[PDB]
Every structure is written in C-alpha cells, then in structure tokens.
Design a binder for this molecule. Structure first.
Ligand code: MG
Ligand code: MG
Ligand code: MG
Ligand code: MG
Ligand code: MG
Ligand code: ZN
Lengths: 83, 83, 129, 24, 102, 220, 71, 135, 221
RNA sequence: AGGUUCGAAGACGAUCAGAUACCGUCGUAGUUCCGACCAUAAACGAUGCCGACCGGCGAUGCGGCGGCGUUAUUCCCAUGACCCGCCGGGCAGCUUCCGGGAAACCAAAGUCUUUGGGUUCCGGGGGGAGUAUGGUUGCAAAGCUGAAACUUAAAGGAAUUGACGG
C-alpha cells in the first residue's frame, strides 16, 4: 500500500504496535484497585508490579511478581482506573 | 520549454503517472492507460463519455496498480464511499 | 548513534519518495527540519506536513507530492561565502533552471536564491531538486 | 610450489642465515 | 567462486562444531558438514525371512530391526554414490528423494 | 510494397498518425522499421560505429560472427542505436540499421541558462549506465560544442544536442557498452521530472480507441 | 568509510601523505635511491668512452643480434 | 524395432483424415485405395505406410477423441458444452449453510436476516494446517 | 458503481453464497488484505462481498469502455474456467483463448496466432502468469479474478472473489457477462437474465459421461 | 603428574622403474591434567562498529501479551504440554524488475556522478618479498615493524563456448 494514512491509525493497529513504535508513546500498564476478601480497604496496585504488595490490615499477599504482570492471588477482586 | 519569448520549445509533453506522479517514458511499454466508462445516474447505462487513468510501469510492476486504480476511482466517485 | 537528525529525516524522505509512498514519517523532529521542510513546501516540492507533538522530540508526517528527485544533505556544515556559492551551486545542482540549496544564514534558514537576493552567506544545510 | 612449503623453505633458510650471522 | 551460500555445512550461529570420524575412512569431518544416513534395515535379508520364520521356535516372532547411523566425508559420500553432483539450479533444493513406497 | 502487420503500423501507413511524438506519447512499441521511415524520410543519417568479430569455439576450431553497432538519428531530436550480430558483415549491418530504427528515442533539449532561442543542451545532468561504463551529460553554454570522446560525440551530435560537457568512468574502451551507456543517458532526458513539467497531464485519446472503426475496416 | 568532520584536516593530510608512498611513481621520485641507482644521475644525456662493442641477443619471439656498445 | 513413423507420414495422415473422414475406414486396403485419388503420393511404399497410419489413427478416433480434428466429434463436443443446462439451477438451493462470521459480514452489508440462510455452528479446535516438516 | 441501481441484489447475494466465492484460501496476500472481512477458525479467509461487487463493477466499466468488443481478450489456462470464458466471449463478442496460451501471442508479430488486444481479463494470475507478463510488453491493462493468495504483480482491476471453486468461477464469469451486457444497451435491467449460471460451470468429465445417459433414461421412462 | 587409545619422528612389511609416500604392523614426542610461556590459523561471513530508512512470506529460539478449544491433577481457576495470533531481540530460510554489481550474487554487498550520517583499520600492476637490514618481544620456535637493487606486459576476477577428466 502506497497510501497508508500515517496521521490517523485505527485503534486496533495502534494497540498491537509496540509501545515505543506507536504514533505517540503510551504505556501498556495501568493501576488497579484490589479487594482482598475479608478486608474493607482498597489497595492501588501497579499492573506490572515488581514487589509483593501486602495489606496493611491483614498479613495477606495480594500479587506475586512475574516476568510481565504481577499475578494476583485467587479470590481477589480488581478493577481498572479511568481506562 | 516556454523560453523567454513565450513559445513552447519542446516537441512533446509526456504523460505523468496518475498515482506516483512519475513521467511515463517513451520506451516504457509496461505503462497502461485505461478508460473507466461512467454511467448515467438513473439507468446505469454507458453515456459515451468516460474518465481516464494512467499508471507508469514501475507501479504496476511492484504490484501496487490495483490499489492505485481503486483509490483513484474512489476519489473520482466511481467507487462508493462505503466500499 | 544518531549524530545528524536532519540527515536521517532527509534520507527517510528520499527513500519514501523513491518507493512511491504518499506519506513519510520522520521520527526525530527539530527546528532545522521544520524550516527545511518549510522551504521545500513553499517551493512546492512537498505538500503539507503535520507535526505529531509528544512530550519528547516530535514526529512529522509529510505528504509527498511525487515531484521530488533528491533531497540530500551536506553533513559537515561548511561555511559558504557568497564568492564560493557558485561552485557549490554548480557542483550540487542538476541544472541552473531548477534546484535549490538550503543553507542556514544569519537571516535564517533559506535557499540560495534568497541568500543571494539579500546578500548573505552562512553554513550549508542541504539541497533538494 | 605450494605456498606453505615455500614458507617452510624460507623459514629453514632464515634459520641458516641467522646461524651464519651469529657465527661471526 | 562461492559455490554454496551455506558453504556446504549447517553452521550458522556457531564458531566451532565438534568433528566426527567418517564411517568409511575415519576422516575428521565437522558434524554439521558430514552426510548422515540413518539406515533402519531388517536384521535378516528379505530372501531369508521365510527360512528364519520356518525355523523359529516361536509362532508370531517379530524380527529385530538394525539401527545404524552412518557419517561420511563428502569424498566417501560421492564415491559411494549416496550423494551425486547436481546442476547449479538443482543444488538449491533440500528436499530428500522420495521413499518409493509403491 | 510495405504490408504492415500491426494496428500501429496500419494506422501509420494510411495517414492516421501524423507525428512520431503521437506514438511516443502513449509509449507504444515500434515493431517494424517501415513505420518511422515514413515519418523520418531521408533525414535519418546513418553511421557504423564498430565491427567486432565475436567467436565461439566448437569441435572443428572456432567460428566467427561479426557484431555491428549502428547508430542513426536525424539531427533534430531523435536518435537510436542498434546492435546486430550475424555471419556476414552486410547482414549484420542491415540488421543493426533496422534495430537502430526500432530503438529510436526522442531527445529533450534544454538551456544552460537564459533561455533565448532554440534549446541546445541537455535539460540537466543525466547519467547513463551500462556494464561498468558510466556516462554523465552535463549542460553546456552555447558554442562550446560537444566535448567528449569521439564515440559519444557522434551519437550526441546526431541526437540534436549542440553543446554538452561529458564525464565518463569505467572501461570506456568497450565500445558496445560505451555507446550503450551514452544512449541510455540520452534516452532518460524525458524520464527526468522537472518543475516545468509539474502541470497535471491532460489525457488524449489513444490512437487505438480513436481510430478503432477504421482499424476494424482495414486492419482485419 | 572516511572521516568528514570539520576539524579532521590533520588526519586527512596525514593519511594522504602516508598513502602517497605506495605508488611506484612517487616512491621512485621522492625516495632518492632510484636517483642513486640511475647511471645518468638525473641527466637527460651523458658522455662516455666505448670500452667494447657487444651484440645482444633479442627476446624470445624475435631473433636478431642487437648492436650495442659497452660504454 | 525401428518401425517408428516420421512427420511426413503422420502429418499427411492427419490431414487426409480431417479432410476425408467420411470416406476413410478401418480396412487398410480400402484406405490405400482411396489415397491415390484423394492425395498425390510419389511412392507406393509411402502411400501404403500413410494408409496404415490412417487405419491406426481411425481406430484411435473411434475409441476416443484424438487431437485430430473431426466434425462429428466437434459437434458432439459443442452439444455437450453449450447445452445440458439443468432444468433446475445448481445455485437455487433452498437453504444455505452460512458461517456466523459471514452472517455478520452480510449484516454489515445490510443483507442480513434472510430466510434462505441457515447458520452453521462454527467448529472448535482451530486445528487446520498440516504438521510441519517430515514425521 | 456508487448508484442505487448499481447495487448488489438479494438474488445476487444468494448466488454468491450458494456458489461459494467468499471462502478464500488459508494464505493471504498483503495486497489482497484490504478485501478480507475476517479469518475463520478454519483458517479460511472471508472475502467482503460488497468489495467484490464494487471491483466487478469497476471491471465492467473498464470492459464496456472499449468500442470494439473484439479488443478485449479472456484467457483461462485451467480447465475450471475455459467453458466460462468461451461462453463469456460468445455472449459479449470478446476474443477467447482457452487451454495452452502459446508464448509470444502478444509480442511475436510473425505468426498468425499473434494478436494485440486492448484489454486482458485473467481467470487466475498464478495459472495465467504467462499472458500477464506478456501484457507488460505491449501496454496492456489487465483485469484478473484474484483470490486471497493471488499475486498482484501485473494486475490492475483485481476482483477478490475466488479462483478455485468451479461453481464460483462460473458464477463470477456469468455475473461479469451480465453486468457488461446491462451496461451496454443489451439487457433492460429489470427482468433477470435468461442465461442460467450453470452454463458457465466447468464440469468434470465423469459428469459429462454419465449425466447425459441418466437424463436419457429419465426421459425415455 | 599421568601415560588407555591414537600417533609426527623412527623401524619393518608391501606397492613401485624408483617409493625416503599413499596401504598395513609396531612405535617416540605429543595427544590427558596443573602451573608458566608463545600469539599464530581458510582465527572466514574470505564481508569493521554505532545509527536511520527501504518488500512480501512461512517458520525457529527466548521473554511478554491476547484468545476457541484438547490435555495433567482437582472442586474450579493458576500452572505446565499443545492450538491460533500480536509485540520485542536473535540464528537463519524462501521469494521479489527495491536497488546495486564485472558478474557470480547481495534485502545488504541497497539507499553512490541524483556522489557528504559519525568513525576506525587498510589497498595502489605481477614478481623480488613479507625477503635483506635496523629496532623490539620471546627460553626457543618464532611474533611485530619492514625496504631496495633488479625483473616483467601482463598477472588476476566473474561468466560463455569448446576440448578433456583414472
Ligand atoms: Mg573451484
Ligand atoms: Mg574457527
Ligand atoms: Mg599402532
Ligand atoms: Mg563512522
Ligand atoms: Mg604492487
Ligand atoms: Zn570418508
């Protein structure tokens, strides 16, 4: 294709492309609210957290750091922050 | 051509590719110039007059001829926008 | 590493022009690139170009009109006096009927004809014909 | 000759020359 | 002239490949360069299968296969006619010859 | 006595196409030499550049054929170079003449500066490439003439160029490649795009569609 | 490739003058030993005394006795 | 061995077959008796060799459509090509087994919701592609 | 075709679905990617029927633009399409070439088989690459009936329908014939065309040698 | 230190016109380990490094991401094994009139008379010659730097035809 519109890429190829190689850099990560069962407070956790996140009210692990994304412990609810 | 005196001193003006804006050479036999016959608005029958597209040999050898023809027909209105 | 941003942009534009592309993206933008593109566009060799502005060095998407032959650069920015501009002009241009040589002058970034019009020299930037 | 064997012949000759020069 | 793009060997991202001895002449050949043939032959001849079957103490005896991997320097491979010279275009295909099942 | 077998040749014969530039506009290939002598009658000068005896070894010694380079062209903006090899010198000469007639390309003449009268030089520096021979044709002011080696000098002279600077590189002693590179340089004077050609091209009717009824009636 | 910096002139001239010794013409003209080996000593002509008259056999494809004089 | 015919006999035999297919037959002597007046053969040996090849080629013709042109064979071919359009079309199927993805395509085309379409159940497994390499 | 009369009809949709002509191959050509709707779990690419209709209308406008109907040539080297191009040329007055396309047909001017048309229509670019390349020596614009994996080197009016199904090939050829006839003053655009699409369908010989006798038995009894 | 095998040198047996060899038997140094030297290989991709751009395709190795499903246990998700894709870095491969080249060929050996991204090393017809000499390193073998006289009109590279092939 000799006439690809570089100015207005559709969001599909925008999301598939590498974070640096996008038209504008955008991180692939996000911040999440995490609900541990049996606890009322809410912890804001990085989606690619490199550390073990703990509840200050309960000696419970919330996420286990992995290569790409911190794996949340089972039974824990989570949602997104503002997309 | 068109010296100070004004007359066009050049024994012909070659055609330029309607896609790549490239000069079609005298011995470039790979070039084409097809006519797309547009129809009347009410019955879809050929009305005598048409429109013309020219493609240089370079474009229709690298394979991008069909895309260029489709783009020009879309721009001129032959192909509906909802293609 | 990258030591001449303008050289990279000009090479990208030349390659996309040679490949028949309609649009080219040049990753590192700068004031020099914008002024060079302004000269080229005011002379009609390229169409409108739009600057994508991230918080880093921006990107530029240039609309190629297909009427460009070569947009090379002169990498060591040689000082060009008006007395020796003619040797540069007949060493870098295809003919005396067309072609422009952009050099950064005290009055600004501009082609050689404007530099000769207002009688000033400067440092060479590049050529496009 | 093979280039390797010319190299070997030259090395033998160079050793002989070094010996003769040392003898002085 | 460079006869082959791969220089007649499979070494691509390596510096050194350990050598192996040719099964015919005991020549040190690189492992990725040697011609390998994995012959899976019946331990008895096809002419002698009937006599062995008749003289077997067992009724349904499955005769053993023989598993030998052969390595050849290209000299012994060419002299033993397992590989043959090919035209300049016919050198470029890597597909093994068909087994001739029918 | 000329009986053409071509739509283009038939249109040429029966006064349907008036100028060679009409054919050159649509890049229609010329497949018979009797097309252009109707156009460039008695104006196509001819010159034989070199007769070279190529040889092919056989069982019974070697056999020799003569390769003839013939360059033709009226001194008005058309030129062509043909190469033919045959057993006899005369046959090779005639074949090379026919081929040079077939490969007649138009030449664009420009000005060195201050466009005054008829153009005299190449519009801009063009480069021809063939084998290792690289030939560059630089515009020259009026009156300098063609400064070059003799083999490209005669080809540029018969091409209609009046003044031209030339720079050549490579094995220029290879006369076939040396002439062919200069021919390639001459040919691409129109292949170069210049700002005076920037106007959007208007498309005319091709002779095949403009004269299709007459082609049906005549060219069965 | 080659250096193209604005202040690389010293290296450019150094590499030119270093590489200029590798062609036979410059080495012969500027080394000075070729002048020493030349019997004329940089002169176009010379005067000498004929010590003998000798005939020189021609090269392989030819066959003649070239008439020379030992001077 | 060495009874192979040449172009001279084969081309002439094909020509006289395609010119005189009605008169020729399977008898060798009848064909070698028609050759003298339907053709001019300078030699008797050449004539009877041509007749023998004519007999062989007409055996092949009556057992099958040889490449030699034949007006009855060609009219049979024409009747068998430009006819036998079935009284019902092969494209007027009552129901069409349609992919849900193609159903979505038709929906976006605005030609969805057609009573002649039956939605297939898409397969599960994504197990296309042949296994790579040998074994 | 951007007009309302120049729109696909439900009957056309039914023909297209019945004959196939939307189930492409598992391989996708990068220049054919703009015609695909979606890839199934089978790996079969789904070709947009509207884009196919638009490209067919473009090909029809290209064909009807030539005053001499003999100046357009139709070539199908593969058997599955030779009958289609024969019937297409018979209906539209074109010049057909079926079976072996001899080299030099457009370029070697000596033989009587030499011909120089003004348009090329190709059943399959892979099967008909020889007339494709020769068209590049004589300034010959080209239409082809390209599949998802068809190369587009010398193709100009590539129609993205199919090249593999005999029913699909017969349907696309019959559809092109009907469109180039309705554009010209031949069909009145109102009643359906009297030529059945089965006429263009290639039939395997074991159908020709059994269907006529089965029909004979059904008629005689 | 250790020395099983193999095996320079060497011995013998064959082959041969000769056979100081190819073949066979034996066999020293060596080949093995530790410590210390040497710094050379067709040390090769006969192809400097960093950076940018310029075709398509199917795979492969690692990491990450997203999805029908099959499978392992278990009650489900994790997590492994497969299946289908995307992203990033690698070893590569096929195709291409991108382009280049003398061509073989090369997506780099392209973006080069339309010649300039930064930089390092390095060649100037074939021999003499990587020789002489000087200097320097090394226990030695040798390594690094390195001429000249003289001689020569060709030597070479890629491809084509033919001839020839134990
Ligand atoms: Mg060799
Ligand atoms: Mg190594
Ligand atoms: Mg032993
Ligand atoms: Mg650098
Ligand atoms: Mg030298
Ligand atoms: Zn061996």
């Amino acid at each position: 294709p000799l006439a690809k519109d570089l100015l207005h890429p559709s969001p599909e190829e925008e999301k598939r492309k590498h974070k640096k190689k996008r038209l504008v850099q955008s991180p692939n990560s996000y911040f999440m609210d995490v609900k541990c069962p049996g606890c009322y407070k809410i912890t804001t956790v990085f989606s690619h957290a490199q550390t073990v996140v703990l509840c200050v009210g309960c000696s419970t692990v919330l996420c286990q750091p992995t290569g790409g994304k911190a794996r949340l412990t089972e039974g824990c609810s989570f949602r997104r922050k503002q997309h | 051509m068109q010296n100070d005196a004004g007359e066009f001193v050049d024994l012909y003006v070659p055609r330029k590719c309607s896609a790549s804006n490239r000069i079609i050479g005298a011995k470039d036999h790979a070039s084409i110039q097809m006519n797309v016959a547009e129809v009347d608005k009410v019955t879809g029958r050929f009305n005598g007059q048409f429109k013309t597209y020219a493609i240089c040999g370079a474009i229709r050898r690298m394979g991008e001829s069909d895309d260029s023809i489709l783009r020009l027909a879309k721009a001129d209105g032959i192909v509906s926008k909802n293609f | 590493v990258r030591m001449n941003v303008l050289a990279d942009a000009l090479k990208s534009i030349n390659n996309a022009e040679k490949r028949g592309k309609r649009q080219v993206l040049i990753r590192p933008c700068s004031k020099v690139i914008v002024r060079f593109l302004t000269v080229m566009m005011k002379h009609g060799y390229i169409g409108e170009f739009e600057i994508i502005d991230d918080h880093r060095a921006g990107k530029i998407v240039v609309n190629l009109t297909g009427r460009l032959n070569k947009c090379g650069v002169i990498s060591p920015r040689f000082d060009v006096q008006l007395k020796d501009l003619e040797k540069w002009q007949n060493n870098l241009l295809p003919s005396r009927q067309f072609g422009f040589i952009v050099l950064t002058t005290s009055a600004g970034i501009m082609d050689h004809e404007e530099a000769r019009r207002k009688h000033t020299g400067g440092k060479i930037l590049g050529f496009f014909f | 000759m093979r280039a390797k064997w010319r190299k070997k012949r030259m090395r033998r000759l160079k050793r002989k020359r070094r010996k003769m020069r040392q003898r002085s | 002239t460079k006869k082959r793009r791969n220089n007649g060997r499979a070494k691509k991202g390596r510096g050194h490949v350990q050598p192996i001895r040719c099964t015919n002449c005991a020549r040190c050949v690189p492992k990725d360069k040697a011609i390998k043939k994995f012959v899976i032959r019946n331990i008895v001849e096809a002419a002698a299968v009937r006599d062995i079957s008749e003289a077997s103490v067992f009724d349904a005896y499955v005769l053993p296969k023989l598993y030998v991997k052969l390595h050849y320097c290209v000299s012994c491979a060419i002299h033993s006619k397992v590989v043959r010279n090919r035209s300049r275009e016919a050198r470029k295909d890597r597909t093994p010859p068909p087994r001739f099942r029918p | 006595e000329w009986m053409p077998v071509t739509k283009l040749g038939r249109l040429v014969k029966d006064m349907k196409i008036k100028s060679l530039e009409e054919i050159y506009l649509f890049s229609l290939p010329i497949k018979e030499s009797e097309i252009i002598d109707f156009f460039l009658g008695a104006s196509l000068k001819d010159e034989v550049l070199k007769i070279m005896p190529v040889q092919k070894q056989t069982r019974a010694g070697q056999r020799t054929r003569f390769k003839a380079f013939v360059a033709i062209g009226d001194y008005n903006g058309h030129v062509g170079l043909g190469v033919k090899c045959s057993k006899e010198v005369a046959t090779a000469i005639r074949g090379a003449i026919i081929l040079a007639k077939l490969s007649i390309v138009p030449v664009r003449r420009g000005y060195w500066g201050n466009k005054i009268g008829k153009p005299h030089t190449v519009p801009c520096k063009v480069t021809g490439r063939c084998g290792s021979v690289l030939v560059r044709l630089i515009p020259a002011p009026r009156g300098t003439g063609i400064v070059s080696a003799p083999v490209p000098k005669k080809l540029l002279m018969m091409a209609g160029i009046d003044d031209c600077y030339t720079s050549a590189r490579g094995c220029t002693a290879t006369l076939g490649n040396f002439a062919k590179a200069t021919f390639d340089a001459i040919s691409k004077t129109y292949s170069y795009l210049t700002p005076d050609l920037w106007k959007e091209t208007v498309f005319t009717k091709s002779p095949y569609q403009e004269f299709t009824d007459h082609l049906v009636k005549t060219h069965t | 490739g080659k250096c193209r910096g604005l202040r690389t002139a010293r290296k450019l001239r150094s590499h030119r003058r270093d590489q200029k010794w590798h062609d036979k013409q410059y080495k012969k003209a500027h080394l000075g030993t070729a002048l020493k080996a030349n019997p004329f000593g940089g002169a176009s002509h010379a005067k000498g005394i004929v010590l003998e008259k000798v005939g020189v056999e021609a090269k392989q494809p030819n066959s003649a006795i070239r008439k020379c004089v030992r001077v | 061995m060495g009874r192979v015919r040449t172009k001279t006999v084969k081309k002439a035999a094909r020509v006289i077959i395609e010119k005189y297919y009605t008169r020729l037959g399977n008898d060798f002597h009848t064909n070698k008796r028609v050759c003298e007046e339907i053709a001019i053969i300078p030699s008797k040996k050449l004539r009877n060799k041509i007749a023998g090849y004519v007999t062989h080629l007409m055996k092949r013709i009556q057992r099958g459509p040889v490449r030699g042109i034949s007006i009855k064979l060609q009219e049979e071919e024409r009747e068998r090509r430009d006819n036998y359009v079935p009284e019902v079309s092969a494209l007027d199927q009552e129901i069409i087994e349609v992919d849900p993805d193609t159903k979505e395509m038709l929906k976006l085309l605005d030609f969805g919701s057609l009573s002649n379409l039956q939605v297939t159940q898409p397969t599960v497994g994504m197990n296309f592609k042949t296994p790579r390499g040998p074994v | 075709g951007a007009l309302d009369v120049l729109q696909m009809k439900e009957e056309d949709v039914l023909k297209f679905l019945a004959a196939g002509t939307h189930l492409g191959g598992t391989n996708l050509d990068f220049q054919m990617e703009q015609y695909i709707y979606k890839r199934k779990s089978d790996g079969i690419y789904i070709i947009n029927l509207k884009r196919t209709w638009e490209k067919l209308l473009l090909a029809a406008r290209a064909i009807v633009a030539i005053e001499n109907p003999a100046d357009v040539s139709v070539i199908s080297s593969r058997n599955t399409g030779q009958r289609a191009v024969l019937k297409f040329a018979a209906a539209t007055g074109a010049t057909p070439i079926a079976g072996r396309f001899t080299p030099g047909t457009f370029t070697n001017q000596i033989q009587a088989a030499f011909r120089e048309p003004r348009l090329l229509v190709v059943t399959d670019p892979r099967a008909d690459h020889q007339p494709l390349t020769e068209a590049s020596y004589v300034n010959l614009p080209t239409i082809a009936l390209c599949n998802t994996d068809s190369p587009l080197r010398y193709v100009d009016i590539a129609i993205p329908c199919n090249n593999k199904g005999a029913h699909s090939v017969g349907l696309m050829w019959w559809m092109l014939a009907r469109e180039v006839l309705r554009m010209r003053g031949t069909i009145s655009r109102e009643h359906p065309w009297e030529v059945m699409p089965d006429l263009y369908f290639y039939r395997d010989p074991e159908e020709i040698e059994k269907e006529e006798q089965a029909a004979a038995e059904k008629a005689v009894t």
